[PDB]
């Protein structure tokens, strides 16, 4: 089904087999600079998202669930609603306003999950 093989579906209906999307983010060949800006576009686009995902310790594209509790005021709707009643479009449009904060929280709170789990393990 390619690039947009599950658009419009609920979250659970497309929370697996994401490989068919992430596996293809590079393309094209020679027309000088005006095209070659689309070849190194992968660095501008793919690697940025990759390092955002990897800085949190969520390297490896699973459903990575790490630290921060979900504050109720952000959506305030039940688990079933967000999980299987909503779709990605308006969910992104509603929550995209707060992701820059969430990534900062995820990366700044990451150091406390690894600061002492190397040498206390040595004692163990």
């Amino acid at each position: 089904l390619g690039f947009l093989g599950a658009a419009g579906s609920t979250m659970g209906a497309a929370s697996m087999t994401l490989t068919v999307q992430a596996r293809n983010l590079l393309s094209g060949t020679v027309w000088g600079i005006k095209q070659l800006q689309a070849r190194v576009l992968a660095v501008e686009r793919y690697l940025r998202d990759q390092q955002l995902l990897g800085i949190w310790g969520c390297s490896g594209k699973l459903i990575c669930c790490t630290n921060v509790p979900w504050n109720s005021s952000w959506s305030n709707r039940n688990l079933s609603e967000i999980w299987d009643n909503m779709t990605w479009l308006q969910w992104d449009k509603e929550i995209s306003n707060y992701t820059q904060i969430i990534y900062g929280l995820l990366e700044e709170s990451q150091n406390q999950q690894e600061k002492n789990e190397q040498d206390l393990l040595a004692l163990d």
């Binding site: 190397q118 040498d119 393990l121 040595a122």
Partner: protein, 462 residues
Amino acid sequence: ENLWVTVYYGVPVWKEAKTTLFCASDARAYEKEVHNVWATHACVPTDPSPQELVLGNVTENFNMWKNDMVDQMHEDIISLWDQSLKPCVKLTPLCVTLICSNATVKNGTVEEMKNCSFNTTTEIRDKEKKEYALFYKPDIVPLSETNNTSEYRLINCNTSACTQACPKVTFEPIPIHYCAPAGYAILKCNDETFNGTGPCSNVSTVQCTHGIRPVVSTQLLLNGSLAEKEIVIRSENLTNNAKIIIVHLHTPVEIVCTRPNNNTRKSVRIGPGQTFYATGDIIGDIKQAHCNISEEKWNDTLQKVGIELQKHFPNKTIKYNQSAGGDMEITTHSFNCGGEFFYCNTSNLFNGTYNGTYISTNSSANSTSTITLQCRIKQIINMWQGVGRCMYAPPIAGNITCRSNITGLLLTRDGGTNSNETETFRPAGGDMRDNWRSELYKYKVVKIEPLGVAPTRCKRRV
């Protein structure tokens, strides 16, 4: 005790670097057509982000002359400004047998431009027809060293092939940032007590710099940044006279120039589908072009500068003297503003004496005390070597005023020894590398290698 080698990433470590760079100019590089302003294909809208930040106990040697932004700035200025007159008419028809006459104030204290004619190949290549247009007096060479006092030719076409600077391209000095690529970082100092080399005290870092001014001149320094409250002298080796001193002031002295003639354009169609411009029939009475400077403040600024050169020359008296010989391209103050080129001799700024006694002009009896600079003016230009030298600027219509400020001076010492008390101080033909190093010295670009090693007592499973 037992410990193991442990690896850290994101380590704040750097090395001095050389690298290819960016540019950034503010919103004023985008509104107008293609091929003007000269950053409109290239420069990114700047932001001062990330913000300028202080460092701790950092100690690095900011060598002024061991840098590549000055090299870079020259190669970029030259290589963009050399190709940037390619999309224009490029002459060859006019390299002809002009014919002249007399309109000459036979004994005037004036350096007027000449009227001659020429046979013009009209747009159709086999209907030739005559035409005329004025020409500034240096630009034309007589065809012959004989009694051929009629026959005259342009100074080009024996050396190269030139270009009429298209009017769409303005030469005006728009302020430019240069910037370094991501993964390289730039450093800066805030202190004013710099001397050229050595470890700086109040080190700082910026993503990239402030707004530079690319102007072009030889003796003095116009439009650009400034120091704050003390005069500072920067140079490599005071032992030798062969090298340039660069003089920054705490206050600038106030300069203005004008061309009172009211020039007008006289347009001809030459060659198929392209048009030549020339100075037309000059309206009004002929007057002489010039510059204007305030006598009281320039003398006071001389009085304030002398104490800086007596930091290292207490055994000899300061005196100023004329530019040390040479031709049109080095003896004069030669810069630009307003679409035309002036050539002005600054001997009436550089003779005097400071011998310790500072006697102020205050309270001022004549605030209008000025000393003037008489000028010639050109259209044909050889702006550099290895830049596609030969160019022609079409003349601007009307009359102009270019009030500006002396940001700094470039000077040069004259010799003396064996019971000599009369060393002196003269202009300098600072190259463009000796123009812009006044405005690029603050910054050094460094290369990060954030992979590092440190001790740790980890024993994660084997």
